Design a protein around this ligand. Structure first.
Ligand code: HEM
Ligand SMILES: N[C@@H](CC(=O)c1ccccc1NC=O)C(=O)O
Length: 376
């Protein structure tokens, strides 16, 4: 509510803006034509010829969100080029400066993130039909046959499915705060079901995303410069920071959906000095700031886990366990997705060298989720 959470679409930006003020057309034209401009070897040339446009004409939140998307898309294309190794280590001043300033205003790092290319990058084809794949579209793509429509929309359609679980979270805390045993139990059962529906939405990834396309084309435009050998020291945001800075690649791992129900269930992923807790805390740096606050204010609330154990209630424990189980399913299925779209295409013809780091990260987080089951 005050954490920029929509009841219909959750962490997704409701009805995002598609057009920037005519003042920014030179940006909009480049971003809308990245498939051709990258194809024809012209993208870097047009970026380097841009003037510097003041960000003072981005008048409202949704317009700044759209412009972060345009500039984020232009940056990725510029840095990565055609994605065959010939990279760019200096983002020109005429983009670097307005982008860094706009990102500082929005409290996001100056790199493309999930909130840009999934949460803000969509529209209904017909605004009176409902939110289904057939009635939506993304607003930007990088290459012909990069399956960005399928990967962004389905990631987004999962976000929407999670929203029906998220709009219950107040009812859970109100239930506790008033000792409403049955209200609490139905809320948790409802959350578990919504999360089970989310898992079903996740299945549509196979209909709309080709593994070779993802691993070989879309994964390139989504890669950052933070522990990247190709940009060992980060990117120079010319005219804004004297020294190159390092920013993580925009993944789905930036989604607030898994952490939101980790925090709500008292599952302590982001607890410790371990490497998995770190990456999860890091990824919060890459989320919209209203959602960064939502997660922290959830950790500050009285624990669901502690209350269900305090009551000697098989009922609440089953329902709380139903949610914990749903989370384990999502991560299990999510591990099966990672194997299809990254693990297998890697071992042909690129983190987790041989599999080691990627898989063991996601396995670790799933295991922490497993051990949280109350059972008894
Ligand atoms: C469909 C193809 C997908 C692929 C190939 C993929 C890949 C990955 C990768 C590589 C990571 C590790 C972080 C990194 O290395 O940057 C990760 C973690 C993660 N992913 Fe995805 N992802 C996909 C879809 C999704 C979707 C649809 C969601 C949620 C709506 C999601 C949510 C997450 C989360 C939350 C993490 C962090 C681990 C955790 O918190 O449990 N992913 N994924
Ligand atoms: N006026 C700036 C130059 C600059 O940043 C710039 C680059 C391209 C097009 C216009 C520019 N001037 C003001 O935004 C200066 O004094 O360095």
């Amino acid at each position: 509510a005050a954490y920029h959470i929509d009841e219909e679409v959750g962490f997704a930006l409701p009805n995002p803006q598609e057009n920037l003020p005519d003042f920014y057309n030179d940006w909009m034209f480049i971003a809308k034509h990245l498939p051709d401009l990258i194809e024809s070897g012209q993208l870097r040339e047009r970026v380097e010829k841009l003037n510097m446009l003041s960000i003072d004409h981005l008048t409202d939140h949704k317009s700044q969100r759209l412009a972060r998307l345009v500039l984020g898309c232009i940056t990725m294309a510029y840095v990565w080029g055609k994605g065959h190794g010939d990279v760019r280590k200096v983002l020109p001043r005429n983009i670097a400066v307005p982008y860094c300033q706009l990102s500082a205003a929005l409290e996001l790092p100056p790199i493309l993130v999930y909130a840009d290319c999934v949460l803000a990058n969509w529209k209904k084809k017909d605004p009176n039909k409902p939110l289904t794949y057939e009635n939506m579209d993304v607003l930007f793509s990088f290459r012909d046959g990069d399956c960005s429509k399928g990967f962004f929309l389905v990631s987004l359609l999962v976000e929407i499915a999670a929203a029906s679980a998220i709009k219950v979270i107040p009812t859970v805390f109100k239930a506790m705060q008033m000792q409403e045993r049955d209200t609490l139990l139905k809320a948790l059962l409802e959350i578990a079901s919504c999360l089970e529906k989310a898992l079903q939405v996740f299945h549509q990834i196979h209909d709309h995303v080709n593994p070779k396309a993802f691993f070989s084309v879309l994964r390139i435009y989504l890669s950052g410069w933070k522990g990247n050998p190709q940009l060992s020291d980060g990117l120079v945001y010319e005219g804004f920071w004297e020294d190159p800075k390092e920013f993580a690649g925009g993944s789905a791992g930036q989604s607030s959906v898994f952490q939101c129900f980790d925090v709500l269930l008292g599952i302590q992923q982001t607890a410790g000095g371990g490497h998995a807790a770190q990456f999860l805390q890091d990824m919060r740096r890459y989320m919209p700031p209203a959602h960064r606050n939502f997660l922290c204010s959830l950790e500050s609330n009285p624990s669901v886990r502690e209350f269900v154990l305090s009551k000697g209630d098989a009922g609440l424990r089953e329902a709380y366990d139903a949610c914990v189980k749903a989370l384990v399913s999502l991560r299990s299925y999510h591990l099966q997705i990672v194997t299809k779209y990254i693990l297998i295409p890697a071992s042909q013809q690129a983190k987790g060298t041989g599999g080691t780091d990627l898989m063991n990260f996601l396995k670790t987080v799933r295991s922490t989720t497993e051990k949280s089951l109350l059972k008894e």
